[PDB]
Each structure stands twice: as structure tokens, then as C-alpha cells.
Amino acid sequence: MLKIILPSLMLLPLTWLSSPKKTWTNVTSYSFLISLTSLTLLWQTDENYKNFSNMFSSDPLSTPLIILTAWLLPLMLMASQNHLKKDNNVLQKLYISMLISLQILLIMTFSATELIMFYILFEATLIPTLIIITRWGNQTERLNAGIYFLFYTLIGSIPLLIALILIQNHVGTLNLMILSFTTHTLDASWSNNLLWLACMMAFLIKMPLYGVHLWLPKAHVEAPIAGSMILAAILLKLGSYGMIRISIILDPLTKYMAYPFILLSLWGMIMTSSICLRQTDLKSLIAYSSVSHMALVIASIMIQTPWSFMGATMLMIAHGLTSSLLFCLANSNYERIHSRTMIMARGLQMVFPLMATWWLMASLANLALPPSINLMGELFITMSLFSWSNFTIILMGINIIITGMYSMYMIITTQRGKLTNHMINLQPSHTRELTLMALHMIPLILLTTSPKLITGLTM
Amino acid sequence: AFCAPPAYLTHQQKVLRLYKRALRHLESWCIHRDKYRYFACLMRARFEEHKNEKDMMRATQLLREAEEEFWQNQHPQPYIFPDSPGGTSFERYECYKVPEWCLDYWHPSEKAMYPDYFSKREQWKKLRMESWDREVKQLQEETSPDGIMTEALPPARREGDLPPLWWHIVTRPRERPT
Amino acid sequence: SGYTPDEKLRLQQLRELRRRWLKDQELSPREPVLPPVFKAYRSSLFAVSHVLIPMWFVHYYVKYHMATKPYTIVSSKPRIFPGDTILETGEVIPPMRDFPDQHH
């Protein structure tokens, strides 16, 4: 991993030692080249996972998440340029450094071999995330959004820290490979049931689980666009990735311990998807859509089947690209009229025909049109849950209906109908903006062509 | 569509609107023109027999009973002109009614394909800019003292003045835009 | 009642402007200024480009990438009737019995 991490660290001096007129062109270009180098992790010609050293590894679960992380950094930079163009030069460089910091921290997080190392990097990400939300968010509610985000995470993370220390005191190590091979059955004591919850809650809050999700709609509505991109695409996946790594040592208590969280997720995914039908704020709508999708990820990880893990891995990647695309699409209208109210701008297909095409594909991805990886992940999750209990299809069926309703509702409301023609400041789409949309959507199509790369650990 | 409605409909207005609806729904029932013409004349005779009712209170009661009768004898699926509200072609061309301010974003290579059109458009923009201040002053001058106000707008009284708030009416897209 | 004398005047002034705006929408002769074999042959040349050439590519893929892999092209078996000859072997299928015939 050092041949990926070291060049990423060199982006920081590159940012600060570049001329003001070359900073964006420089950092974006090398960020693309670093994404290219991360593809080396996909050269996997056997079934032994790559252990580069005692500290860094990569297997079929972390490899897609590392590459998606590397790809997001250039995309976030392009997304940020227009709304930062009034900041002075030092403030622009500070913002870029925050974005690089997350890229470095997240790549290290997904390749860490030891759980307290994962925990430290997992917690470190809050610092640049909070700074981005609160220093560059637009509204007065960005400060409250920062508090919710930081402290929903932290209250769950403290029990996680206790559990990790406890496991290490008992086993002698937090190395993941050794924990895997030497794992032994747990007794079903009250003490072990609290251990299960301490190991799971921080990851479940991060997903977020329905019930403790209020931080996420707040954080998205208030964050700048690059903050929304990283939060929806990668940061939520830390919880799902954490749950998959740590659940190997929690057997057999997950068989009964999972029931309340399957119930919250399967019912909760209907509550949050139905909220999207009556949401007046476009960013909030996309955010609630994420909570509904991540509810599926929670359910499939909880039932721990080969299909359920594979469907969760695909959905994690597919949602990452799709939701980041939707935030970028919404931000392009906001940068023109400076409102997130969905019903304000209307008939936009009349004036932005190619941007409306990007809107349609993002919406078709979101409602899981086959053969997209969006549908493939949701399909295999549905099959595994049906096996777990045939009555799950009732709640799946309701969510599928509602997801089509709000996905097409967003398109009809904003792109169709009569143009709101008092909006004479609807400047034509930027080349940068149209390029940004394509950089989301080409990988989604390419991954649909070769879905072996995101199947995860079980297939 | 061109004239704003008043605060309330006078008794005469309500009667004449029922008359137009009643005939139109009769036409939907009859279909055939000879049959419709026969019953259209019978319908007019019913409005005539009470034309000279001077009671008012009886006239208002006669309007009530006719409207109740209309709702019961209403055609469930009345004929609608294709371009009217509820018609099949209603709002069919709205996706083609591009506002004129879109041309302000055309590229110079796009504008160079209509050198004559964009010269005339400049004259219309210059005319618009010069007239605005006078238009605003006229509306301010012609405000009534008592608060009672309506949506009707005044004409241009002087010479060289354009009627106030004309740009959104005069330059609106064509009905059949393309 | 009809238009008030003010409504009549306003509609006249707008009518003069609107009809001038609509006249202005006409294009001049030079606008738009744009910068600069028998029948059946057109049916022939379309066939070569959009039937013959793609059929070479599809036939190549079918012959040398699909027919060379197991079970990629699986047909149901042809019908064999009493009295046929099988080319692969040469065997002749025995005829059927006798019914005996019947008349409607």
C-alpha cells in the first residue's frame, strides 16, 4: 500500500507549493494518476489475499472500497472548484488539503490489518469531515449538523473502543487474520450480549441504522458538495465494512442478536423511502434515499449468508457512485438558483437537455434498473432475505414500489412540466459539470460489464 | 386567459355561464347536428320564459334550481376542444415554448447563424430598456387612493410611451412555437 | 359588458407591438448562415455495409468462438419418422403397422 499512500501524501506539498493558477490543474491530474495506481490491487490471480506487511493488506472487500476512495478524490476536486472560486488562495489550498486528508485516512482505514489501527483511522476521519461541513457549509444549521455528526459517531465509538481493548486483553492481539483463524464459539451470556452490542453499535450508527439516522439528513443538507460526496459514497461504508470485519468473532450470538436490527432496517427502509415522497428539499430527499438503501446493507450483513454478503458488497459500491452522482446533479441547479427546494426549478429538460439525460440515468440507477449493479446487489439481498424468512419479500416489495415512485417523482418534478421561466440565470451547463456526471456514470456502466470485481469475499 | 376575473360574478354573468355550459353538454348528448339544433332551441325557450323576472330573489332561486338540475343531467364525459383545459392537446407544446431570454446565452458561433435576427433583437432590447422607467412611473401615478385594486393595467396615455408591463405579453412564445 | 375604453386602448397598443414582434421573428433569405448513383444501388450499398459486413463478423464469432465451446449452441433433436434414413449411420427406420384404413 505504500506505493499508493506515499504519492497521496505528496499531494499535500504539491497543493501548498503550487502556484495559485496551477493548484487545481496539478492536484486533480495527479489525483487521477493515483486512482490509476490503485488498480494494481485488482491483479488477483489466486485465492490468497494480499498481505503487504504486518500493517497493510487488501482483499476483495477492501480493494473495491480503496479504489472507489481513490476515484472520488479527483471527482470531489472538480465538484468544489466553482463554489470556492471566491475564496482566497490559502483558503482554497486548505480545502484541498482536507480532501486529500480524507483520501489518505480512508485508504489506510480500508487496508489496516489490526482493529485498533482501524479504529484510530476510523475516528481520525471525523476531523477533516467536521471541518469541511462547518467551515464551508452555507447555512447557520451547519454548526448543529457538525455536532450531531460528531457525537452520534463518538457515543457509539467509545463502546467500540472498550470492546476492542477487551478482545485484545483476552486474545492477545487485534490482528484480523489471527482473529479469524483462532476464533472460538462465544457463550450466550448477558456479558457477551453487551459485548456484541459494543462491537456493533458504532458501525450501525455510521450506516446509519434506522432510529439513529437523524445525523445524516442534517449533515447532507448543510455540507458542501464535496462533503456530501464523500459522506454518502465512502463514509457510510465504514460501518458496513466494519460490521463485516468484526462479525467473524461474534458467533453464534448474531443468530439472535441481529433480530432487532433486521427489524429496524426492514421496517425502517419503508419509513425512510416513504419520507422521500413528501420531502421538499432535494438534498434531504437524496439523503433519506441513502438511509433506505443502507438499511438493506444492514439486513444482509446481519443474516451472514454468502449471497447476502455479495449483494451487500455490490450495493455498497453501486450506491456509492449513484448517490454521489445525485448530489452532484442537485448541486448544479443549486449553484444557479441557490435553493435546495425541489419544487422551485421545473421543466429543466427544456434548457439543460444533456444534464437531464444524466438526471435520468442517475434516477434509473437509483431505482435499480437491470442489469445495473444497483439491481444486482438489491436482487441478491432480496434472495438471501427470502431464504431467511419468506415474509421479508412483503417489505421488500413495498420498498421497491416506493423507490420507483420517488425516483421518478424527482425527475418529473425538476426536469419536466413547464419551465419556471422567471429563472433567467439558468446558465448553460459547464463542461466541468457534464464531465463530472460522466465520471460517475461510466464506472457504473463498466462495473455492470464486469461485476466479478465487486462481489466481495464470499463469491 | 387575457382578462383577469373580477372580485365576484354579477347575477347576469352566472346565468350566461350556465347557458353556455347547458348548451355544450346538450351538444354532447345529442351528437347529431339536427337533433342538437332542435333541443338547443328548446333550451333557449326555457331561459327566455324567465328572462324578465324582476323579483331578483326569485331569479336567484331560479338560478339555484337550474344549477342543481344541470348537475343531475350533466354529461359524464362532455366534449372538450382539443386545446382547452382537459383536452387531448392541452399543454402539448409547452415543452417547445422556450422563453426569449434563453438567447442571451447563445454562443457567438450560434448567433452568427442569424445575423439579421439578432440585430432586430437588439432594437427590441433597447426599446425595452428606455421605456421601463416611464412605465414604472405611470403605474405609480395611476394608483387609486382607496385601496380597492384590480389586475387591469392602464394603457399608454402620452406619445412615445408603451403600455406598462408589456414585455411578457408582447414577446411571449407562439402557440405553435416550432 | 364589452371592453372599457381603457381596455380597448391597451389591447390596441399591445396588438401593434405584438404583431411587430411576430413579424420580426421571420428569417431573412440568407438566414440561417450555414458554413459550407441510381435507386436500388442505394439498396445494394446499404446491404453490403449493414448486412454483409456485420454478417462476416457475426459468423466469425459464432463459428470460431461459440461452436468451439461445449453446450453453447444446443438444438433439439430433429424429428425421425418411420421410413427415414439416418445419414450419420445409414440405418433405415422400420415402417409402421397397418391400422387398417378408414373412410370419412
Binding site: - | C102, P177 | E26
Partner: peptide, 13 residues
């Protein structure tokens, strides 16, 4: 036959 200008958004970009 008269040809009229068709108003469109800027499709250059």
C-alpha cells in the same frame, strides 16, 4: 412560405 426563428436554449455547450 415564411420561415420563422425557433427559439432554443444554447446547445453549443
Amino acid at each position: 412560405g415564411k420561415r420563422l426563428f425557433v427559439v432554443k436554449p444554447s446547445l453549443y455547450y
